[PDB]
Amino acid sequence: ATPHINAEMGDFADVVLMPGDPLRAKYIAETFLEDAREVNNVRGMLGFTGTYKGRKISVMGHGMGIPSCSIYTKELITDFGVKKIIRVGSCGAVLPHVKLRDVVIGMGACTDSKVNRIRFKDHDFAAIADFDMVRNAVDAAKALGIDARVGNLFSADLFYSPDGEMFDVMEKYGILGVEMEAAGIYGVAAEFGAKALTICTVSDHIRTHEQTTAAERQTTFNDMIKIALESVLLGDK
Amino acid sequence: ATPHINAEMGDFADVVLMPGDPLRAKYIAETFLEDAREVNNVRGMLGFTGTYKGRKISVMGHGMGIPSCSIYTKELITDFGVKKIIRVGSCGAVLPHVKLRDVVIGMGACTDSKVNRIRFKDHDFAAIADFDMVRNAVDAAKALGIDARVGNLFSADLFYSPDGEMFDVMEKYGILGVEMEAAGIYGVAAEFGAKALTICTVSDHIRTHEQTTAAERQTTFNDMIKIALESVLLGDK
Amino acid sequence: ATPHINAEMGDFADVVLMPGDPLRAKYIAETFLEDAREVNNVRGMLGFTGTYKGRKISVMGHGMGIPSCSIYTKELITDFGVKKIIRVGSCGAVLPHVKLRDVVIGMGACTDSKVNRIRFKDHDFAAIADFDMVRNAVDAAKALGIDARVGNLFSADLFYSPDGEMFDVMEKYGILGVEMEAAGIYGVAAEFGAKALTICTVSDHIRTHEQTTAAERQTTFNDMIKIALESVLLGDK
Amino acid sequence: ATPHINAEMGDFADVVLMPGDPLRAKYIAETFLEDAREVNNVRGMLGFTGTYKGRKISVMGHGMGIPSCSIYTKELITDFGVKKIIRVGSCGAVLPHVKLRDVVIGMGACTDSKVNRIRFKDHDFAAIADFDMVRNAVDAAKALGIDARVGNLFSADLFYSPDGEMFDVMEKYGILGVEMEAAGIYGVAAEFGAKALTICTVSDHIRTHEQTTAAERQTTFNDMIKIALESVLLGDK
Amino acid sequence: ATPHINAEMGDFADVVLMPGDPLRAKYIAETFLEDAREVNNVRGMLGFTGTYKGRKISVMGHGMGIPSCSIYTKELITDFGVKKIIRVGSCGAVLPHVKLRDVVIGMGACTDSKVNRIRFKDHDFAAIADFDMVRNAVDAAKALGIDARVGNLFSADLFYSPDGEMFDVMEKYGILGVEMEAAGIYGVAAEFGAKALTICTVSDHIRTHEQTTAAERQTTFNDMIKIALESVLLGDK
Amino acid sequence: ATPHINAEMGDFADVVLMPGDPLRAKYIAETFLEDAREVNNVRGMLGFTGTYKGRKISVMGHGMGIPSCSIYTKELITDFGVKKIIRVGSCGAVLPHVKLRDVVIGMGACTDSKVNRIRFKDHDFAAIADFDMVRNAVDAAKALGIDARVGNLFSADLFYSPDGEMFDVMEKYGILGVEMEAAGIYGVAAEFGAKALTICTVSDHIRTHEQTTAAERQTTFNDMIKIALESVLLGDK
Ligand SMILES: Nc1ncnc2c1ncn2[C@@H]1O[C@H](CO)[C@@H](O)[C@@H]1O
Ligand SMILES: Nc1ncnc2c1ncn2[C@@H]1O[C@H](CO)[C@@H](O)[C@@H]1O
Ligand SMILES: Nc1ncnc2c1ncn2[C@@H]1O[C@H](CO)[C@@H](O)[C@@H]1O
Ligand SMILES: Nc1ncnc2c1ncn2[C@@H]1O[C@H](CO)[C@@H](O)[C@@H]1O
Ligand SMILES: Nc1ncnc2c1ncn2[C@@H]1O[C@H](CO)[C@@H](O)[C@@H]1O
Ligand SMILES: Nc1ncnc2c1ncn2[C@@H]1O[C@H](CO)[C@@H](O)[C@@H]1O
Incomplete structure (x- = not known):
């Protein structure tokens, strides 16, 4: 067990999907995983492990912000043998041609945080995802x-x-x-030696101040999850 | 309701106690408040409202990290009429003369985050608590x-x-x-014109290592909460 | 005995009041101290030591700017056993509700200087006063x-x-x-383990030029010095 | 004609390969392009246009350093209708398992230059290549x-x-x-609206201080060029 | 007439010599100037104006540190028509071949201060003296x-x-x-369009503590002042 | 030979003139030097050596940008015994009173590059020329x-x-x-203990726009070169 995760080596799959909302992780387990069992509830950050088409898979929320997700991804990588992390969240669009419920894959990630400058001697570290995972x-x-x-x-x-x-x-x-x-x-993945990818669905528009509505939210969110889970299967091949 | 809090004006007291762990917020409401009702559960970040010796009081978790607590404290201050925020948490010690179970009050807070520089034209903003709250x-x-x-x-x-x-x-x-x-x-308090204070109990010495959890540790955690609650009453007079 | 102070251990009290204007040091010694004796003249930065209601106290100017006061406070602390430093000066206000002649106490101090970043590995150091001194x-x-x-x-x-x-x-x-x-x-105090406090009287409003009489100004100054001196006695109890 | 390129719209293909060495660009034209004609010689920065399997293609050196290549790529994009830029150069390896004459594709690029901070309000801009070009x-x-x-x-x-x-x-x-x-x-591509990719062949090892030798240099360099040229054809499909 | 200088336009010559130690201003006026008259006493920063071989010249201390001298030089330049400022002081050496009592002329000045970055949009401003003044x-x-x-x-x-x-x-x-x-x-001179020069005599070697007699020190100081004064006359021709 | 210069000790004079354009180096050798031989052609960066009024002199291009000229100047200084570098180029004007065809001498150089901060512990290094060379x-x-x-x-x-x-x-x-x-x-000169100077002719006014090239412009470019060459002779005596 780690400071923020009460579990033992083996409880998590080698691949973990992570939404910011722990309640959403529970929804994903109930909706997509078979024989899903709860593996963590410390601080209410729910984590589950089950199978998707016979593939062992885990899903756990990571909270909001770089400092919060940095804690959870690090502990999974160093004490639970997790090799691939796939963030599945929401985002705001700034480009006019990017529409609500659109799906975006972050090959790279810009930031106004100082965490990577602290790691890279105050220079510019290009925070990138794993190429194979992006292609998958x-x-x-x-x-x-x-x-x-x-x-x-x-x-x-x-x-x-x-x-x-x-x-x-x-x-x-x-x-x-x-x-x-x-x-x-992406910074944690590089520092502790693992692979990662972030997938998001446009939940709102920064400008128009328009946001998720109707049942489009579920279908769209379910599409993101389908992509993530299926991308892992391609990765295994 | 706000993007992260599903409640309405009046549901929260004008003073909110905030632990980092949602489950600690439930523990506090149950242990120290009378007639406590749950007022929020979005993303599992439980919030409650009740009374302490007749005084209307609220308690809600804020998650881990500056980005997380910045979201919740801002929404409370600008949308729910909150005037005072008292963070009640744990910290690691660095000074040798600082022992386990010591109660620490942050008159000021240093940081390696870039949020206050972003707010203050890249200069040094001294993040401080409200004087009367510290004295209380x-x-x-x-x-x-x-x-x-x-x-x-x-x-x-x-x-x-x-x-x-x-x-x-x-x-x-x-x-x-x-x-x-x-x-x-403290940065959010200054930006939106509110008052804040942080109180912590030493959970471990980053020096001598080894944390604290048992009867004596739990007694000290309760003392911190009593200090927080009693300080509000002093402030009212 | 020191590069900018020609005196020996014991010539200064463990508490020193410091105005920016050197001329004010002699005024304070003649107006508020008993049995005062001169203890420094280097570069014309006159220093005096006497007693206030029985308590040993010293007074000496620090010059304008962070670099200048940093030199004097450091030497006093490391070579003359000084435990507390109280700066007494003037300031300009930017807040409308802050009026001319108002007495302001700096629990914290923001800055556009680089000295503290040089000390704190380029992170944000919250330059704060000693809490007891503030309350006193x-x-x-x-x-x-x-x-x-x-x-x-x-x-x-x-x-x-x-x-x-x-x-x-x-x-x-x-x-x-x-x-x-x-x-x-505050940076020097933190660096060499001593205590400090800055008290100021509003001499002008950086937006709405006002007017004051020469007599009103001396009254306010004498008020600030009385506050400083009486605060020391409170700290002693 | 632009300040550093004496040519007119139409003289360059919509895709340009760029080595740092202008002499190498001449070598590429003579070795891989048909009906290759010189289109620029200002400051000795040789540029050529021809066909590769019927595909119109240009090749021009860009000099050493970000400031030098920034000039040339910008002028090509804004005044010559160039849509894709492919840098084909050499690099030094820092990883033990990366061998001489190895081929590397930069999906991302870290840097100690200040150019992107100047463009991105002093924050972290992840300098990335175009995904399709990387996959090609x-x-x-x-x-x-x-x-x-x-x-x-x-x-x-x-x-x-x-x-x-x-x-x-x-x-x-x-x-x-x-x-x-x-x-x-990559910064210029994003600022002026075009697509780019950098391919390099390990010419030396930073540690071992081992560098290119024998005729391995030509074969390896020729392999990089084959990849670049062929990748464009896939892109056209 | 100015916040830190109680004098009127015409009281200062268009050339001012400035030592750090205020006490040196009176010494220079008595030792090198003819028909000197006092022109400032605010905060004990004594100013004098007289003539050297017929040329009108002023002398006044500037205090220790960039913040202090920035105040005085600015006021002299913007409100008293001063065209040239020559600082005459002491320094510590780090180079072995630079000996005690050596006369050093700063054509340029490096710094760990943030004042010039604040002026030059956070880029590198080369703080330099006026070339003619250096040659003079x-x-x-x-x-x-x-x-x-x-x-x-x-x-x-x-x-x-x-x-x-x-x-x-x-x-x-x-x-x-x-x-x-x-x-x-140098930053102030550039900001308000005037000319400046700093001349110093090595008072110590920051590595190999040396020794000098009080008489040798006065001789070197008088030598520096003669150099400064004669340099002004050369600049006049 | 060095990584970017294929020549041997003795091939270059102890003083090198450096235009940015390789073709200008050829133009200079041909126009002002007697018995000039080409000593380098790597990457097309032509270098030459000959004599001016009996004095052994070299001239070689340095490419565009700090990263480019830093490579060549360093190799010259550490591997070919060069003691003085004189850059002879063009610049854009900003000051209105600075006209076309004016000869500018850089006693100092400001910059938006990060190279000198990397060299100087992130502080302000004043990049300056060698005084005697400026005077010459x-x-x-x-x-x-x-x-x-x-x-x-x-x-x-x-x-x-x-x-x-x-x-x-x-x-x-x-x-x-x-x-x-x-x-x-100037940064390279300081790092490796050499001497440097930059002279420029205004090619255009970033203000009034419009450059200069014709008989009068070419005459001014030649004057700059004569100034550079003649300054070397003065330095020799
Ligand atoms: N405009 C916006 N700015 C920042 N984060 C945004 C956002 N819209 C949605 N998000 C996503 O949901 C969380 C916070 O609501 C964040 O974790 C996540 O980024
Ligand atoms: N050494 C340490 N570094 C950072 N945070 C520390 C800590 N010791 C305790 N904490 C407290 O508990 C949370 C994370 O465990 C954090 O929210 C909170 O700061
Ligand atoms: N508006 C203002 N800005 C800066 N400093 C101010 C000031 N009004 C008074 N002061 C006081 O006098 C000194 C410099 O004038 C400073 O030491 C001291 O702060
Ligand atoms: N160790 C190294 N550091 C920096 N650049 C290196 C290099 N080895 C090869 N290069 C490549 O060739 C050019 C300069 O020789 C550069 O344009 C290009 O990066
Ligand atoms: N080693 C040293 N470091 C910094 N300043 C030094 C010095 N030696 C003498 N000084 C001179 O006296 C003043 C402060 O002591 C400064 O104004 C002036 O530079
Ligand atoms: N406005 C300007 N900005 C930057 N560089 C300028 C310039 N005007 C002329 N130059 C000079 O010519 C080269 C690039 O054209 C550069 O090497 C050299 O600086």
């Missing part, structure tokens, strides 16, 4: 007939930022989605 | 026969730091305890 | 029927700043007064 | 039976760096190759 | 049969720095002397 | 009846800057011309 997700999406843009995400420390002008800068440089974890998870 | 807590602690240390806390972004040299630095400049939120909460 | 000052003021605000000060490196926009920022974050030393003194 | 190069390499690692490169401003310790940091974070342009080219 | 000083020294080195000075914010390693760096880059004002004065 | 050039220019301006240059990393606001800044602080190398060369 693209193919899986293709097979499901679901569209998906591949590019840069922006991991923000402040959901309520006092610098609205920065959104113009994000847009100018082609940021596909604004979330709060990618850059940190 | 010091006075409540004395009335309970408990001696509290008042000084600087260090709010870290990485629980698992790559550095290590930074701890010699914290010790050299007198940091009393290391946690992950005070600096963020 | 507040109570001494109350006993003298004087109103005193406690909060953040801003220590500027440039009296004539090219960045006019920074004052709006200071106002937005509740800065009480603008001066040029606090954050530097 | 991987497939092309596969078809040719040539191996190729996909990952992060490090664009250095100083070939002769006074900070040797940084190489330990690069190695720790999995940097595949050390060159001097990738991060800048 | 060199020639005046030669005519007086005195040896003078011209190069870089380092303006420190902290006389007592916690970073001992920085002196090795200064030595490696050829720093001639360490003081605490040059870069600040 | 000023004296040679006078003997030729040419009036040269001596001051600060600004070495930019981006020829096509995203900012734009920075030019108002350069103008405000008196920058004489904008180029892309001086700061890098």
Whole structure:
């Protein structure tokens, strides 16, 4: 057991899907995993392990922010033998042509956090995902007939930022989605020797202030999960 | 309701106690509040409202990290009329003369996060607590026969730091305890015109190592909460 | 015996009052101290030691700016056994409700200087005063029927700043007064393990030029010194 | 004609391969392009246009360093209709398992340059290549039976760096190759709206101080060019 | 008429000599100037104006540190029509070949202060002297049969720095002397369009403590003042 | 031979003139040197050696940008015995009173590059030229009846800057011309113990726009070279 996870080596699969919301992790287990059993509940951060088409798989929430997901991903990698981490969350769009419920794959992640500068002697560390995992997700999406843009995400420390002008800068440089974890998870993956990928579905528009509605939320969220789970199967082949 | 809190104005008291763990919020409401009702459960971040010696009081978790607690504290202050936030948590010690089960009060909070620089034109913003709240807590602690240390806390972004040299630095400049939120909460308090205070009990000595949990540890955690609750009453007069 | 102070261990009391203007040191010694004797003249920075109601106290100017006061406070602390430093000066206000002649106490001090970043591995060090000293000052003021605000000060490196926009920022974050030393003194105190406090009287409003009589100004200054001196006696009990 | 390129719209193909050495560009034209004609010689930065299997293609050197390649890539994109840029250069390895003449594909590029911070309001911009171009190069390499690692490169401003310790940091974070342009080219691509990719062949080892030798240089360099040219054909399909 | 100088336009010459120690201003006026008259006494920073071989010249101390001298130089330039400022002080050496009592002329000044970054949008501003003033000083020294080195000075914010390693760096880059004002004065001169120069005599070797007689020290000081004064006359021709 | 220069000790004079364009190096050798032989052609960066009025002199291009010229100048200094480097190039003007065809001498060079901060512990290193070389050039220019301006240059990393606001800044602080190398060369000179100087002719006014090239422009370029060559002879005596 680690400081934030009460479990033993073997309780988690070698691949773990992670939404920020622990309640969403429970939903994923009940909706997609077979023989799903709870493996963690410390601080209410629910974690589950089961199978998807005979493949052992785990799912656990990671909380909001780089500092929170950094704790959980690190402990999984160093004390539970987890080799691949797939964040499955929501994000805000800054580009006019990016629509609600769109699916985005972060090959890279920009950030205003200082964590990677602390790791990289104050220089620029390009926080990137594992290439094979990115390609697996693209193919899986293709097979499901679901569209998906591949590019840069922006991991923000402040959901309520006092610098609205920065959104113009994000847009100018082609940021596909604004979330709060990618850059940190990618930094941990590199520091502790594992592989990671972040997939998001546009839950709202930063400008239009339009947000998730109706039952489009479930279908779309379920599509993201399908892509993630299926992408792992391609990875195993 | 707000993006992360599904409740309405009036559901929260004008003073909120905030542990990092949602389950601790439930433990506090159950142990110290009378007629307590759950007022939020979004993302499992349980919030409650009840009364302490006739005084209307609320308690809700804030998750781990500056980005997390910044979201909740901001929503409380701007949408639920909250005027005071009192974080009640745990910290690691750096100073040798600081023993286990000591109660620490953060008059100020250092940090390796970039949020306050983003707010303050890249200069040094001294993240501090509200003076009257610090005095109220010091006075409540004395009335309970408990001696509290008042000084600087260090709010870290990485629980698992790559550095290590930074701890010699914290010790050299007198940091009393290391946690992950005070600096963020104090920044939010200043930005939106509210009042905040952070109180912590030493859970372990990053020096002599070994934490604390048992009868004596649990007794000290309860003293911290009584100090927080009693300080509110002093403030009311 | 020291590069900027020609005196020996024992010539200074363990408590020193420090105005910015050297001329004020002699005024304080003649007006408030008994049996005063000169203890320093190097570079014209006159120092005196005497007693106030029986308590041994010293007074000496520190010069304008962080670099200057950093030199004097360090030498006093490391070579003359000084335990407490109380800076007594003037400041400019940016908040509308802060009036001319108001007495301000800096529990913390923000700054655009780099000295603390150089000390704290380029992270954010919260430059704070000693809490007991702050409370002693507040109570001494109350006993003298004087109103005193406690909060953040801003220590500027440039009296004539090219960045006019920074004052709006200071106002937005509740800065009480603008001066040029606090954050530097607090940094030295933390570095060499001593205690410090900065008390200031509002000499001007950086937006609405006001007017004061020469007599009103001497009265306010004498009030600040009385607060400082009486606060020391409170700290002794 | 632009300040550094004497040519007119239409003289360059929509895709341009770029080695740092202009003499190498001439070699590529003579060895791989048909009906190759010189289109630029200003400052000796040779540029050529011809066909590869009926596909119109250009090749021009870009000089050494981010400031130099930034000039040329920008002018090609804004005044010559160039849509894809493929840098084909050499790099130094820092990882023990990365061998001489190995082929590396930079999906991302870290850097110690300040150019991207100047563009991204002093935050972290993840300098990444175009995903489709990366995948095209991987497939092309596969078809040719040539191996190729996909990952992060490090664009250095100083070939002769006074900070040797940084190489330990690069190695720790999995940097595949050390060159001097990738991060800048990726920044320009994003700023002016085009697509780019950097491919390198390990010409030496930073540690072992071993470098290119025998005729392995030509064969290996010719393999890189084959991958680049063929990857474009896949892109057109 | 100015916040730190109680005088009117015309009271100061268009050329001002400035020592750090206020006491030196009166010494220079009595020892080198004719028909001197006092023109300032605020805060004990005594100012004088007289003539040297017919030329009108003023002398006044500037206090220790960049913040202090920045205030005085700015006011003199913007409100008293001062065209040239010559700082005359002491410094510590880090280079072995730089001997005690050596006369050093700072053509440029490095610094660990943030004032120039605040002025120059966080980029590197090369704080330099006026070239003619530098050459005038060199020639005046030669005519007086005195040896003078011209190069870089380092303006420190902290006389007592916690970073001992920085002196090795200064030595490696050829720093001639360490003081605490040059870069600040040069910054002010550039900001308000005036000319400046800093001349210093080596008072100590920050590595090999030496010894000097009180008489040798007065001789060197008088030599520096003669160089400064004669350099002004050369500049007039 | 070195990594970028295929020559042997003795092939270069102890003084090298360096234009940015390789073709200009050929133009200079052909126009001003007698018995000139080509000594390098690696990457097309032509270098030559010959004599001027009996004095052994070399001239070689350095490419565009700090990273480029840093490579060549370092190799020359450490492997070919070069003791002086004189950059002879073009710059854009910012100050209105600075006209076309003016000869500018960079006593110092500001920059937006990070190379000197990397060398100088992240502090401000004042990149300056060698005093005697500046004086030699000023004296040679006078003997030729040419009036040269001596001051600060600004070495930019981006020829096509995203900012734009920075030019108002350069103008405000008196920058004489904008180029892309001086700061890098001065940093290399300090790091390896050599001497350097940069001379430029204004090719255009970033203000009034419109460059200069024709008889009068070419005459001024030749004057700069004569100034450089004649300054070497003065230095020899
Ligand atoms: N505009 C926005 N800015 C930052 N994060 C945003 C967001 N919209 C959705 N998110 C996603 O949900 C969480 C917080 O609501 C975050 O963890 C996650 O990024
Ligand atoms: N050494 C340490 N570093 C960082 N956070 C520490 C800590 N010791 C306790 N904490 C406290 O508990 C949470 C994470 O365990 C954090 O929310 C909170 O700060
Ligand atoms: N508006 C203002 N800005 C900065 N400093 C101010 C000030 N008003 C008074 N001061 C006080 O006097 C000194 C410098 O004038 C400083 O030491 C001290 O803060
Ligand atoms: N160790 C090293 N550090 C930096 N750049 C290196 C290199 N080895 C090869 N290069 C490649 O060739 C050019 C300079 O020789 C550079 O343009 C390119 O990066
Ligand atoms: N080693 C040293 N470091 C810093 N400043 C030094 C010094 N030796 C003399 N000084 C001179 O006296 C003042 C402060 O002592 C400074 O104004 C001035 O530079
Ligand atoms: N406005 C400007 N910005 C940057 N560099 C400038 C320039 N005007 C001329 N240059 C000079 O010519 C080269 C690039 O054209 C550069 O090497 C050299 O600096």
